[PDB]
Structures are given as C-alpha cells and as structure tokens.
Design a protein around this ligand. Sequence first.
Ligand SMILES: [Mg+2]
Ligand SMILES: [Mg+2]
Ligand SMILES: [Mg+2]
Ligand SMILES: [Mg+2]
Ligand SMILES: [Mg+2]
Ligand SMILES: [Mg+2]
Ligand SMILES: [Mg+2]
Ligand SMILES: [Mg+2]
Ligand SMILES: [Mg+2]
Ligand SMILES: [Mg+2]
Ligand SMILES: [Mg+2]
Ligand SMILES: [Mg+2]
Ligand SMILES: [Mg+2]
Ligand SMILES: [Mg+2]
Ligand SMILES: [Mg+2]
Ligand SMILES: [Mg+2]
Ligand SMILES: [Mg+2]
Ligand SMILES: [Mg+2]
Ligand SMILES: [Mg+2]
Ligand SMILES: [Mg+2]
Ligand SMILES: [Mg+2]
Ligand SMILES: [Mg+2]
Ligand SMILES: [Mg+2]
Ligand SMILES: [Mg+2]
Ligand SMILES: [Mg+2]
Ligand SMILES: [Mg+2]
Ligand SMILES: [Mg+2]
Ligand SMILES: [Mg+2]
Ligand SMILES: [Mg+2]
Ligand SMILES: [Mg+2]
Ligand SMILES: [Zn+2]
Lengths: 52, 50, 136, 119, 84
Amino acid sequence: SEKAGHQTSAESWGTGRAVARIPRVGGGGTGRSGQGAFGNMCRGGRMFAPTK
Amino acid sequence: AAQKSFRIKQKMAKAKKQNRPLPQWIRLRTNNTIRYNAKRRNWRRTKMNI
Amino acid sequence: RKHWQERVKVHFDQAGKKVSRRNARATRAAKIAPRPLDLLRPVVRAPTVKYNRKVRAGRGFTLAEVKAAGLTAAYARTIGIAVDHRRQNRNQEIFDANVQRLKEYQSKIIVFPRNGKAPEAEQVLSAAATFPIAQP
Amino acid sequence: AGVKAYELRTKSKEQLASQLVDLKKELAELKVQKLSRPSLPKIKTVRKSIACVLTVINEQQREAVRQLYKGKKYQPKDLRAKKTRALRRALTKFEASQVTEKQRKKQIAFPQRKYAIKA
Amino acid sequence: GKGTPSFGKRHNKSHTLCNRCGRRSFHVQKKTCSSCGYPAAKTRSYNWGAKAKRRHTTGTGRMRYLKHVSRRFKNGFQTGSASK
RNA sequence: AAACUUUCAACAACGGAUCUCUUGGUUCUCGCAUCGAUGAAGAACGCAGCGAAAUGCGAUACGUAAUGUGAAUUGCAGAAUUCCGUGAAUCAUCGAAUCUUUGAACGCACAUUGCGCCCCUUGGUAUUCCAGGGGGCAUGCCUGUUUGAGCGUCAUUU
RNA sequence: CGUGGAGGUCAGUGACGAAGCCUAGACCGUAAGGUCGGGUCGAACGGCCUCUAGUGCAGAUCUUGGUGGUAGUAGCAAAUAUUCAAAUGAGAACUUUGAAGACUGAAGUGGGGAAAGGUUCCACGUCAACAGCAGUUGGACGUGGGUUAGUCGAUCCUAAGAGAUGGGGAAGCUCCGUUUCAAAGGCCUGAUUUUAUGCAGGCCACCAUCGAAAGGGAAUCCGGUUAAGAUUCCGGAACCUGG
RNA sequence: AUAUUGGCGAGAGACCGAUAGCGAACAAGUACAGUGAUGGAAAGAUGAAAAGAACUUUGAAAAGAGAGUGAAAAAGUACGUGAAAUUGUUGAAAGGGAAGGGCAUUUGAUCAGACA
RNA sequence: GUUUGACCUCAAAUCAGGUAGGAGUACCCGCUGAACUUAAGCAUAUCAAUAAGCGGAGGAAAAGAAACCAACCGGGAUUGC
Ligand SMILES: [Mg+2]
Ligand SMILES: [Mg+2]
Ligand SMILES: [Mg+2]
Ligand SMILES: [Mg+2]
Ligand SMILES: [Mg+2]
Ligand SMILES: [Mg+2]
Ligand SMILES: [Mg+2]
Ligand SMILES: [Mg+2]
Ligand SMILES: [Mg+2]
Ligand SMILES: [Mg+2]
Ligand SMILES: [Mg+2]
Ligand SMILES: [Mg+2]
Ligand SMILES: [Mg+2]
Ligand SMILES: [Mg+2]
Ligand SMILES: [Mg+2]
Ligand SMILES: [Mg+2]
Ligand SMILES: [Mg+2]
Ligand SMILES: [Mg+2]
Ligand SMILES: [Mg+2]
Ligand SMILES: [Mg+2]
Ligand SMILES: [Mg+2]
Ligand SMILES: [Mg+2]
Ligand SMILES: [Mg+2]
Ligand SMILES: [Mg+2]
Ligand SMILES: [Mg+2]
Ligand SMILES: [Mg+2]
Ligand SMILES: [Mg+2]
Ligand SMILES: [Mg+2]
Ligand SMILES: [Mg+2]
Ligand SMILES: [Mg+2]
Ligand SMILES: [Zn+2]
C-alpha cells in the first residue's frame, strides 16, 4: 500500500535531546507515544523503496 | 453534583448497569474466548468525561 | 516536475478488455440477428497531398448517390446504409463507385416483409468484409 | 409452545383482544414469579404470543383499510409502494413512452427493417 | 506557578454533550459542536481529516435502513408475498 | 582448604527468538447500479429465562408475520413432534409488519427528558373542572381552489 | 559461499521421525561455508539445471522487545505519640471492644454546602492484585439495598450579551442587523331602512427565541422514623394558587 | 467505445506471514490521552478429543508429594517448538593490583580413524 | 352610476396535490486557489491552471451531430487507444 507507514502523526524531537533524531509519535496516554516512525529501520514504518 | 440533569443521570445509570464482571456461565460455553471484562470501569481509575 | 506518480496508467486489463469487447460483439450480434453489426460505408478519397493517393471508407453515402441508386435517405438508413448529408460530390469516378456499391448491396441483401413469415437465413456479421474497399 | 398465527387468523377482533389481555395478565404473573425464580422459560413464549397476536391484529386492520381504499387515486403513504426515493420520483411508463405526432408518423412510415446479407 | 498549582483551578467545562453526535464537544458559549458542526445542517468533515472521515463515515453505525437496500434491489423491489 | 570472581559442561530458571502453522492483509481482473421529508447516514437510551462486550433488534425490542428446509438448540434451563408432520432453529430465504428518544429534523425550544395551540374521543355522580387515548400545527417554491387589497386600467342614463 | 519465492528434474528425504534448537563428539574447504553422530522435538523439507528479489549487520546518541552490574544499595526521617488486656484469626505494632496517655482547640483534625466526581453512601460475604511495612482491615474484590416534595431548587423573568424572520451583501460555506425597509393581529357592535340565499360599521397598535440551581420570585413547620431517606416518609398542625 | 483507491457481488497472484502484511488476523478506530480540533496502541498457537488432574496425604491456604487422564504433562488453561542476553544448583579448573588473544609444548580430561 | 361590475397587479389559508434540503463522494461537471520545491535575473518562470476550501449529478458524467478540419482527386457528430 502506498499509505503504509505514513498514516502517523509524528515529528522529530531535535538534536541534543539525548535520544535519536528519528521522528516520534506525539500525543500521550498510550504506548505508541514517543516511538520512532517513518523510517525503514523503525517498527511499523515504511519499507525502503516500496514496490510499485 | 447533587443537582444534576436527567441526561447526566441517565448516562450514570447506564454506567452503573455496565459495571460488573463476567457471568460465570459465559466461561463454560463452547469455543469461548472471552476470559475477563476488558471494558470494566471504576470511579477512581478512568473518568467517564461526562 | 509534476506529481507524475499520482497519474500512472498501466494497462493490466488489456486481455480483460479484449474479452469484454468480444462478449459485447457477440451479445449485439445475437440481439440484432440477422442483420450485420456494421452499416454500408462509401469509398472516399483521403485528404492532403500525403494521403490523396489512397481511397478509404467514408462516413456515409451522399444524398445524390442515394438518389442515383434509387432510394430515399430514410429508407436507406432503415435498411442499413450509412448516409452523410454534409459530404458533397465533385468527382465522377467516386460518384460512380459509390453508386455501384449501393446497387451491389441492394442486389446482395434480402429485406424481410413487415408482416408475414420470415425466410430464415444465417447472419453475416461484416458488411465491410462482404463488400471490401478496393484501390482503383 | 405458544399461539399459532394461522389459528389466530380464524378469529374475530374481540376474541383477539381478550386473548391479548389474558396474555398480558399471564406476563404480569410471570414477572412476579421471576423475582423469586431467576430462570423462567415461559416468559419467552408468552412474549412471543403477545407479539403474534399484535401482528395478526395489525394485519387484519391494514387489510381492511386497503380494501376500503381500493380503486382510489390517493392512498395513505404507508400503504403506497416503497421502492426508493429516486424510483418514486422517476417518470412513469406512459410518460416515458410519450412521443410527438411527427415522431409517431416517422416511426410508422420508416421503422427499422429486418434484413440480412445473403442474396 | 503556571503548572501544578494552576491545574487545581480547572473545574468548569468548555464543552458539553452534543445532541447530534453524542461526543463531549458541544461548546457551551458558542453553542456549536467542534466535531460534527451542530446545529449547522451539514455534518462537519474535511478532506485533510481522512482519519476522522473514516471514524464517522457510513458503516460505522447500524445502517438500520441502508443494509436491506441491496437485498431489495436483488429481488427487484418486489411486492406481495410468497404463494407457498 | 573453603568462601568469592571467572571459564568450561549437565540440568533447572528468565524471555519469547527460530521453525511449522493462518477464518487476516495487499495487489490485479471481472460483473452490477441500489440512500434520504413514504424521514437517510450518524447519535443516545433500552431489549435475551440466567449477558459486560462483539453481533442483532426497538416497549411486537439477540426479535413478530410469510416462504423453504426438515429435527434441533446446547453452558444450564426449557421446547420435543401427535413420528406418520401447517413443524426445531443463534438455520436459510424475505415480498407483510413493528420500528423508543433523536438526527437534513419539521408546533416553539433544548446545558431543560422545558413550554404551547387545534380537532376527535373516553373516564371521573360534571353546562363550567381534571386526566387519559388517538390525530395534527416548519420554511422556500410550483400548479390549482377559496377568501381578499389597491382611482393601477376600464365599462356603467330606455 | 549463503537466504525468501518460481519452472524443470532426482518415480529425491520424512511418523522405524521433516523443519527448528542444544552439543566436552567427527570430517571436508585458504575462506564465505558445507557434511556426519548424540540429545531435544513433532510435520513437513532438500540436491542439481535454471528464473526471480523487500537476499547476508557490530556499530547509525539506530527502531521494537527483553535483560544485567549498580544493589538487598540510596532510601520508606515534614505534619509532637503512643501503651496495657481481652476477643477474632493459621498468622495481630497496624482489626474490634474495654482500659490509659495525648492532639485538633469553634479562622477546628467539628457540623453543612457550591463546582467537580458518579455509587465512592449502607449491609452481607470476602483477600489473589492494590493500600511503596503489615493486614483478619479498607474509598479494594464479589452480591445486593438505598435518593419519595403544590410549599426546597430547576422550570418563569430579565442583566452584560447571544440570535432567526422582513430585507440587504457574498461564487459560496454563510455575513450584517434585532425592529427595522414588512400588508408582521387582536378586539367591539350589528334586523346597517332592508333590493330579498354574497359582511357591514368601528377601535387599539410594535415585535421571535435563548441568557442566573449566588440577581428578581406564590405558599410549611414541629415531633418521630432508617443499616443507609428526610423542610420530601409517618403523626399533628398550617399556607398558596386556580376553579 | 472512455473513467472509477466509494458501494454491492465474484475470481485470482513467482505478494506479506503476527516487530511482516491495512493502524487493526483477537469484543480495533477498541483500550487509553487531550477542554477541543484530534492523537491512537499492545495483544494469534494445550490436546485428536477437556478427557482441564477424581481419590489419599502434608499444609490455614496458595500449593507440594503420591495417584490418575492422555501417544506425550520433556502438552497442567504460566499451556506447540522453546535460542540469546541474564540467573540457580552440581562437577572440573584458574586466581599475589583486570581479563581476553597468537606461536609452541607439558599436565589433566575426552575422542575419531586404521585394525590384516 | 357617490352604484354595480370587467380586468391587472399584489396577498392570505394547518386550503387540494406535490417538490428542495441531508448523507456518500473512487470516478464526473463548475467555482476558488497557495506554499514548500526547481531555476533565472529585459524584478520572473516553475511547482500548478495542483493541495486545501465551496457548489452540483449519474451509473457513468461531460462532449456531441460543424458559424469544424483543411487547401487535397478533399474529408465529414462526439469520445477513447
Ligand atoms: Mg508496515
Ligand atoms: Mg503558559
Ligand atoms: Mg477560574
Ligand atoms: Mg468560557
Ligand atoms: Mg433554560
Ligand atoms: Mg529431526
Ligand atoms: Mg533489505
Ligand atoms: Mg544488532
Ligand atoms: Mg560497519
Ligand atoms: Mg542504542
Ligand atoms: Mg538504607
Ligand atoms: Mg511526624
Ligand atoms: Mg498546637
Ligand atoms: Mg491542646
Ligand atoms: Mg504493602
Ligand atoms: Mg464505607
Ligand atoms: Mg463495592
Ligand atoms: Mg446574525
Ligand atoms: Mg429563559
Ligand atoms: Mg435566587
Ligand atoms: Mg443524611
Ligand atoms: Mg405529610
Ligand atoms: Mg501488526
Ligand atoms: Mg512450551
Ligand atoms: Mg544462556
Ligand atoms: Mg480539492
Ligand atoms: Mg444514485
Ligand atoms: Mg458506458
Ligand atoms: Mg449526458
Ligand atoms: Mg445541422
Ligand atoms: Zn456533535
């Protein structure tokens, strides 16, 4: 699916935050918040060069 | 509040009737996969938010 | 450049569309039997100096050609002759060829009576194949 | 157990009304007994008997109203056909098949002839 | 004092229950629901809110009437009854 | 020499990798045209003999009627089925119905289960009072019916 | 050299045990790796010729999940304070009753309410998890009971304000404005000097609706009663409004 | 004749195989968070059949030990297989302010082939 | 005839019968309309007559039987490859 791994509202926390600069899920109150996103090395993210 | 509206009191009544564990005879049914009440609510754990 | 990935046409349904077109042709032939699937088209000369060495199929016979063949436009339309009201005749050879085509078509078709028993016959699906265009 | 619709349909209005009242009284008694005995299977069949009696009564009334309104231009909207909204708003067969006199004359004079390319 | 002490003064309600969609999103002073747009005639939805459209679209509820339309079409919107 | 630390091996822990599974997803193709003032989509509240969900339904409430099938349902209870048959069922089918309060939402309102008006009917020892039951009262626009307004125009001495 | 899938072939391997995993055992390759034995396991899998790709990890303050040393360590030291006996219980520093010592000291650690919460109230049963010790106890767990009004409130009124209609803008979602720019609706009399079965004469006038459980406002008190109700129930004695 | 990531009904793939494939294979747009617009998880596998361990015994009890069911309890609703990190017990060994590695041999333990 | 009417225009009725709204929106017909981006330097072009916003339909919609294409020995509605 062309939308796989992209239906996520996430943003990077910036440099110098003692964590990796991968975009992270916002919001709160759930285990999803703060997890990495959008990257091919991230669980639940988008694969590298998706098949067409 | 003590002086509440009927809509609020009706929602409270529905929540009170929903507040229960599973009946024991549910567990005895064939191919039963329900083992606990996963939507149970308590007054001091999750607020109903009106 | 533009967002070309949002508009990519891939023809995965080429074989499926071919099957659907053949099914539509068979269904229309069964519904329209015994008359053919196409009307009789005239011979015209292709425009421009690049293609004027060839003749091809036009849209329909002219009113002058139909009248010379001895039919009315309405009756020719009912019996399966394409009639074009905006094409004009300025070439005697083309006019004679179209009149000959109309006469041969009238000789080779059979029109069933509006009331009475029908003489049963097999349907021929292609008037174009029955009366091919020949390069003079 | 319970009542049967085909046996109910052979009776009159007052008999059905009396049967319905008796069934309601029996349901009240069963609901009284249910406070002491939580498992009372007869409640279900009494409830279904009440529903069946109401169904038969409504059927008889609606059939009487249909016979009363038979052969009239305007009917109650709950007795008219449902279909869909667009289907009800669509043209009727007569309106759709209307033609002008000129078109009718053309159709009579020059219809689509039946022909074949054989001889 | 803008954090924990200020959080102790929150006891009013900006929004209450909406009559149309049932959410706690009916803004009291504006008399408008921030979710469905009540009391406007149209239901609020946006093409940038694809997830919200999916959450509130047709088929998330009971479809009390719309479920049987396909069966009635398949039978041709027939009237009458089976004659045994 | 023990204890302790580390290494090696056997078994036992911790944890859920690997392998084998799959009523799910993803992509492609084919066919069809069917929501709503005859009240849709959505929402709230309820409904099972013993249910909080999912699923189904609306005070006829996991449902009624009709047709088909032909002996179940099952956790327990309870039907069986005159078995020589108008007959289970959480079955299939579905053309007759029921369809609370709402919602474009339509008597006026709605952070209220608030406030009216019209017609019919019934019960309270009732010409006056009260209550119950049934059916109604939105806006824009079209065609027609009826009742009207304005020296705007006109006629009106046998 | 190795991995997932595909065409062909070995009439290939396999419940007398496929794949996987463990192994102080064995062999072949310079190596990538390949092969054999033993244990465990329980249903599929491989050699060769080719086709194909989401095909090989030590790092990216990489992602997700899991686990150590730190470490039985830091700590559980604000709000003066606890003790004796009996009962219950397998078990009592923490439960119950009695006996003592203290504290809040009426601007309370008392008795009621508003917002908010929603059954936390009360009874019975009861300890797996929670109450950073404990627990026989509990705002915990399981099953139920309980909130009674003509006079208390809402409901009615209007406040700052909010907002339709008549109109006028705006492609439009909609905007202005709140009595204007409107034919915006009620009442009285009549035998209307009768033209014969057709309603005549008069009168007064300004704008929907929403907006307070602390503003305005009709009218109720005493005694008793419950496990938990109480100006509402019961007894007695009153009052208001409408007809 | 053309379009069709919505709806209804079908057939398929050299696609993915529970950190993959839709966010969701499961009461998933659920639980939970936010005043609100919105944000949004984790979570599949006993066995062919629950036959889900009767009975005895110790313990207040959870449970243990016998016994029994089942092909198997090296399947006990912590349930197919059951890796690593990390940990316990047993056995062998080394250790005077790190350990680990390379070449060579001693010592202890252990082991294959060739056996006419 | 200071009467009685014919018309015209404008009203009202819980008048008789109807119709519009809203949902869905993949595809379709209109309106409205950026920026990130990519470049240049007669102060711009591109992204783009796109995203977002608004209005309106169907099973397809739209277009459609020339005030056309051409300059040939002429073709002959629209649509799509
Ligand atoms: Mg993914
Ligand atoms: Mg601030
Ligand atoms: Mg404040
Ligand atoms: Mg405010
Ligand atoms: Mg109010
Ligand atoms: Mg094996
Ligand atoms: Mg890769
Ligand atoms: Mg690694
Ligand atoms: Mg490297
Ligand atoms: Mg790291
Ligand atoms: Mg310490
Ligand atoms: Mg202290
Ligand atoms: Mg003091
Ligand atoms: Mg003191
Ligand atoms: Mg503790
Ligand atoms: Mg208590
Ligand atoms: Mg309790
Ligand atoms: Mg306004
Ligand atoms: Mg008010
Ligand atoms: Mg007051
Ligand atoms: Mg009290
Ligand atoms: Mg009293
Ligand atoms: Mg997943
Ligand atoms: Mg296991
Ligand atoms: Mg290990
Ligand atoms: Mg757009
Ligand atoms: Mg349609
Ligand atoms: Mg078509
Ligand atoms: Mg069209
Ligand atoms: Mg013309
Ligand atoms: Zn809403």
